[PDB]
Design a protein. Sequence first.
Lengths: 76, 77
Amino acid sequence: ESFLLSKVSFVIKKIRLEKGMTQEDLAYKSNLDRTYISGIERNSRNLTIKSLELIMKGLEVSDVVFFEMLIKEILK
Amino acid sequence: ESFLLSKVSFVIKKIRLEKGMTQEDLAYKSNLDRTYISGIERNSRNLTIKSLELIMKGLEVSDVVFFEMLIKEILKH
DNA sequence: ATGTAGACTATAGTCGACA
DNA sequence: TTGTCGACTATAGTCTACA
Ligand SMILES: [Cl-]
């Protein structure tokens, strides 16, 4: 059960909630499917870098900021 | 082509060269195929988080450090 | 609003062969 | 040593509907 993947999905959900988005909102902005967004947040599905990039765009967060948050989660 | 993917593969190759590894060495350690390692570095192939995780392990670099380097590349040029 | 189900497509990732 | 091509298997990512 992948450590990094679980940190990545955690950061995605955390950012999503801060911005008050629904999964559907993020799906729309990400150009991804709602169910796949759920799969990622809930079941730690293994997304690609491209899909992560689209999600970062959809969440309206810079990659830099995203990875900064990600580093912070890993450090705990 | 994808901006982020190109930064990721760049960091991977850069680390690989610093450690004096061949693609084959990294394939072995990563538990990935040599040709896929080539695909990533050369053709910006779209790896998953799991495969990136395995590569980070194969390169013997912490995720933290990897993403620190990655942030630095993004901040340029 | 979210998660699961299932069936279906595109492509991740393997493998042998050779330049 | 690396990159490629092509063929194969595994799974990311889609879509519909429903509790
Ligand atoms: Cl070069």
